[PDB]
Structure formats: C-alpha cells, structure tokens
Design an enzyme around this catalytic site. Structure first.
Site, PDB file in Angstrom:
ATOM      1  N   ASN A   1     -88.322 -29.364 -47.808  1.00 39.16           N
ATOM      2  CA  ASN A   1     -89.604 -29.688 -47.225  1.00 39.16           C
ATOM      3  C   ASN A   1     -90.873 -28.974 -47.655  1.00 39.16           C
ATOM      4  OD1 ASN A   1     -88.133 -31.683 -45.915  1.00 39.16           O
ATOM      5  ND2 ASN A   1     -87.613 -30.275 -44.292  1.00 39.16           N
ATOM      6  N   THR A   2     -90.810 -28.165 -48.701  1.00 35.43           N
ATOM      7  CA  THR A   2     -92.031 -27.721 -49.345  1.00 35.43           C
ATOM      8  C   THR A   2     -92.021 -28.220 -50.765  1.00 35.43           C
ATOM      9  OG1 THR A   2     -91.033 -25.580 -49.818  1.00 35.43           O
ATOM     10  CG2 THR A   2     -92.565 -25.727 -47.990  1.00 35.43           C
TER      11      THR A   2
ATOM     12  N   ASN B   1     -78.131 -25.178 -47.417  1.00 37.97           N
ATOM     13  CA  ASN B   1     -79.245 -25.748 -46.728  1.00 37.97           C
ATOM     14  C   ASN B   1     -78.990 -27.268 -46.504  1.00 37.97           C
ATOM     15  OD1 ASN B   1     -81.928 -26.074 -45.640  1.00 37.97           O
ATOM     16  ND2 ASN B   1     -82.644 -24.358 -47.012  1.00 37.97           N
TER      17      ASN B   1
ATOM     18  N   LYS C   1     -80.187 -18.483 -50.372  1.00 39.58           N
ATOM     19  CA  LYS C   1     -79.732 -19.746 -49.733  1.00 39.58           C
ATOM     20  C   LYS C   1     -79.928 -20.901 -50.734  1.00 39.58           C
ATOM     21  CE  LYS C   1     -79.550 -22.318 -45.310  1.00 39.58           C
ATOM     22  NZ  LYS C   1     -80.261 -22.194 -44.013  1.00 39.58           N
TER      23      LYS C   1
ATOM     24  N   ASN D   1     -84.902 -33.157 -40.459  1.00 38.48           N
ATOM     25  CA  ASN D   1     -86.173 -32.487 -40.100  1.00 38.48           C
ATOM     26  C   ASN D   1     -87.037 -32.486 -41.328  1.00 38.48           C
ATOM     27  OD1 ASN D   1     -86.619 -29.682 -41.559  1.00 38.48           O
ATOM     28  ND2 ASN D   1     -84.421 -29.989 -41.265  1.00 38.48           N
TER      29      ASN D   1
ATOM     30  N   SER E   1     -85.585 -25.179 -49.363  1.00 35.15           N
ATOM     31  CA  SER E   1     -86.068 -26.150 -48.405  1.00 35.15           C
ATOM     32  C   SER E   1     -86.413 -27.434 -49.097  1.00 35.15           C
ATOM     33  CB  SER E   1     -87.305 -25.653 -47.694  1.00 35.15           C
ATOM     34  OG  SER E   1     -87.824 -26.682 -46.896  1.00 35.15           O
TER      35      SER E   1
ATOM     36  N   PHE F   1     -91.759 -25.552 -43.136  1.00 34.80           N
ATOM     37  CA  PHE F   1     -92.008 -24.102 -42.969  1.00 34.80           C
ATOM     38  C   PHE F   1     -93.064 -23.685 -42.056  1.00 34.80           C
ATOM     39  CE2 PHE F   1     -89.784 -24.635 -46.853  1.00 34.80           C
ATOM     40  CZ  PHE F   1     -88.759 -23.684 -46.681  1.00 34.80           C
TER      41      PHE F   1
END
Ligand SMILES: Cc1cc2nc3c(=O)[nH]c(=O)nc-3n(C[C@H](O)[C@H](O)[C@H](O)COP(=O)(O)O)c2cc1C
Ligand SMILES: Cc1cc(Nc2cc(F)c(C(F)(F)F)c(F)c2)n2nc(C(F)(F)F)nc2n1
Ligand SMILES: O=C(O)c1cc(=O)[nH]c(=O)[nH]1
Length: 375
Positions: free
Chosen positions: A187-188, A268, A239, A114, A185, A118
């Site tokens: 993804n940021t 994660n 996390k 994915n 994450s 966020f």
C-alpha cells in the site's frame, strides 16, 4: 472459558456484524488503553517456549504489525496472553494514510483486505508512547519478559529510504527489542521495489549500522542504554511480501545470508487473491485464511533457500493450534496473529496456546523447538 472473555467476545461479534472494521479496531484499542480488557494470567507451558537467536519468547504467539500502529494499547494487548507485539509500521513523520473506509472483512472466508497506506502518528509520537510503555513495564508484573518489536518504514514521498530508517532507529531503537524492516507493504507506491536485492542489502547494512552506532555513541552501560526488555541492542528482521519470483526469492535469500540478518518475517499480505466476492470492489492486500497456504509455502521456500540458517517469524492465516504447528513444521520459530483477533476475538491467544500444546503432545514432540522445520 472465563466469563470476562466470554462477554467481550459476544460484544466483539456484535461489533463485527454491525460496525465498520477500522472503527471496531479503534474501539477495542481504546478499551485496552483504558485497561478494561481481560488478562490471561496463566503460566505458559515451559515446553512451548521459543527463541530467535538470544531473544527469548515465553510462548510462541505475538501480534503482527499494523495492529497497534501507534503503540497506544501495548500493555493490554500483551496481557491477552501474547509473548510479544510488533508496533508500527511507523514512519518519521506522521501520515493520515488512504481515504476511508480502507479496511473490509469477509466473515465467510475469514479474510481481510486493507489499503491503509501506513497511517501512523509518526516516529516521535510513537517513541514517546513506547517510552511510557517501558516505564509502566518496570512496574507491571504481567509485562515482565514480554517483547516489543518496532516495524519501521518509509514516508510515502521520501528522499532517502535509508535515511527514514535511520531517523526511526535513532529515535526509538533504544526502546525496542527488535526492529522489523518493512519494504513489503502493498500500500505505498514503490517501497516494495525496495526488495530489490542490491537495494535491500544496503538497507539491511544501513540499519545494523545505525543500531551499532547507538551502542557506540553513548556512554552508558547496556543496562542503562537499552530501555527495553532484553537490555541488549535490538535484533534486525526483515518482513517479506509473498508476491515474488522464485528467482527473486533466491536473490533475497542470498542477501539475507550475506548480511547475517537476525530473522525474517514471512509474510505480509498478498495482492493475488481473486476469489473473494465481497472484495471485488476492493484494492489492497489480503490477510486471513486465504493467505495461509501461500504464506506457509513461502516459509518452506525461504527456510530451504536460506539453508535453515535464518530464523522465521510466521505470519498469515494462523487461527488454530494446527495452523501454528504447520507454520512451525515448515520452519517458523514463532507465530504472529492479526486476522484471528478480528474473527475469533480476545480469547485467541489463550485458545491457540492450549491448542498448540495439546497438539504438540499428540504428535509426540517433547517441546516446540523440536518441531521447527520438521518439514
Ligand atoms: C488493517 C491491517 C493493517 C496492517 N498494517 C501493517 C503494517 O503497518 N506493517 C506490516 O508489516 N504489516 C501490516 N499488516 C499485515 C499484518 O502484520 C500481517 O502480516 C497480515 O495480516 C497477515 O496475517 P493474518 O493472516 O494473521 O492477518 C496489516 C494488516 C492489516 C489487516
Ligand atoms: C470486531 C473487530 C475487531 C477488530 N479489532 C480488534 C482490535 C483489538 F484491539 C482487539 C483486542 F482487544 F483483542 F486486542 C480485537 F480482538 C480485535 N477489527 N479490526 C478490523 C479491521 F482492522 F480489520 F478493520 N475489523 C475488526 N473487527
Ligand atoms: O499500512 C498499510 O497499508 C499496510 C502495511 C503493510 O505492511 N501491509 C499491509 O497489508 N497494509
């Protein structure tokens, strides 16, 4: 085994074959919102209870963060047989996240990639969803003693990462059993760099402090202050992403020890899977079966590095009682599911609870707590 579960799972498999993942995800969230999903009404085995500090879980399986980012389906999801769910990750202001489609699954390897970025309605709206959940909870006998943690993070463009966390704490902390700090994450952009040790220590101490101030700054007794399940201030977990150095890990371990964090969520998603063909196009973090070993090794390492002093919440590739037993024996006190729901469906908590209990019996453990960390 029940027909309600049986029919839904056929439908879910059909959706998995034909329909985009994010859309399917949201459709099942919407069916849960409207309360038309099945319930697991079975007593959980007293021998598979577990705890983190004084936070007690009626069974050891919860739903990981990113599943119900906005808290719109909390009651229905717990009622599938989970003891807890981590909503979020939330940020202070709502964010749309990355261009769609941004989630893909590979049925063969039971894996997901994915790059959501966020997406979430923002702290204020999710706080209002969680409040309505807490009110329903006082009335809904199947929600008694179920735990809701809140994963909190930074808006992508943030002035002050710590400030974002405080804003979330101030808003939603009174309704949370625990708070998960997500600096992991994929993804940021940046964010992950927030796992730098000096930075991370300051993050952790800023958060415990904002929680401490919630307790201080209002005049009510705890029973009225904490509109949550514990009636106590939320525990603080962090996390961790699994893509790190041994040195990095050791450093993080010392900051976790130094700050007396209540727990750690391991782990994660990973950016290190290279061999899923269907994912060649793709950018993002991989979840599911192909994460399981990496996540398990990482549990071993942090348990070791932290001298068994920090409880672990396991995440990554958990599908079966066996997978869960491996997490627990590596050191986890509790497990979280995500991918398993995608591939196995609605029965997942019922089936995995049963599988773990049988296994615990076969291996000759008296209870689950006895198995934690037995290498
Ligand atoms: C579509 C999607 C969105 C996710 N969003 C988040 C998130 O908002 N916060 C977070 O901490 N983890 C997030 N995760 C990671 C999961 O919480 C979990 O750690 C990961 O999927 C590993 O578990 P699994 O192998 O059982 O799926 C997300 C994962 C997926 C697949
Ligand atoms: C068939 C399917 C379902 C799913 N989400 C989903 C969403 C859910 F809410 C449930 C439920 F009801 F059990 F809580 C569930 F079992 C699965 N996703 N989520 C993805 C995602 F997010 F990875 F894109 N693909 C999916 N495919
Ligand atoms: O929003 C996301 O992209 C996301 C967050 C996170 O913590 N982990 C993940 O794999 N995706």
């Amino acid at each position: 085994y029940n027909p309600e579960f049986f029919l839904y799972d056929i439908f879910l498999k059909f959706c998995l074959k034909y329909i985009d993942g994010e859309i399917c995800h949201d459709l099942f969230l919407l069916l849960g919102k409207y309360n038309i999903l099945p319930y697991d009404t079975s007593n959980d085995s007293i021998y598979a209870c577990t705890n983190i500090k004084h936070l007690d879980f009626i069974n050891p399986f919860g739903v990981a963060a990113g599943f119900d980012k906005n808290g719109v389906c909390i009651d229905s999801i717990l009622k599938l047989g989970f003891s807890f769910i981590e909503i979020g990750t939330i940020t202070p202001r709502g964010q749309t996240g990355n261009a769609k489609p941004r989630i893909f699954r590979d049925v063969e390897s039971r894996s997901i990639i994915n790059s959501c970025g966020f997406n979430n309605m923002g702290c204020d709206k999710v706080t209002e969803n969680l409040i309505l959940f807490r009110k329903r909870q006082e009335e809904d006998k199947l929600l008694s003693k179920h735990i809701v943690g809140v994963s909190i993070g930074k808006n992508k463009d943030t002035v002050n990462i710590v400030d974002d966390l405080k804003y979330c704490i101030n808003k939603i902390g009174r309704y949370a059993d625990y708070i998960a700090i997500n600096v992991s994450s994929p993804n940021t952009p940046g964010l992950r760099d927030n796992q730098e040790a000096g930075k991370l220590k300051n993050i952790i101490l800023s958060v415990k402090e904002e929680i401490d101030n919630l307790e201080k700054n209002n005049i009510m007794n705890d029973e009225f202050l904490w509109f949550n399940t514990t009636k106590k201030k939320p525990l603080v977990f962090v996390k961790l992403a699994p893509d790190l150095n041994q040195e990095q890990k050791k450093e993080i371990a010392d900051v976790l020890l130094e700050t007396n964090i209540d727990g750690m969520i391991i782990s994660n998603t990973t950016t290190q899977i290279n061999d899923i063909k269907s994912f060649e196009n793709k950018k993002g973090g991989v979840s599911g079966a192909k994460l399981k070993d990496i996540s398990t090794k990482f549990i071993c390492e942090m348990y070791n590095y932290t001298n068994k002093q920090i409880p672990i919440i396991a995440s990554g590739g958990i599908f079966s009682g066996l997978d869960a037993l491996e997490k627990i024996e590596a050191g986890a006190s509790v497990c979280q599911l995500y991918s398993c729901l995608v591939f196995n469906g609605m029965k997942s908590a019922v089936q995995i609870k049963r599988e773990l209990n049988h296994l615990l019996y076969q291996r000759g453990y008296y209870n689950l707590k006895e198995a934690i960390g037995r290498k």
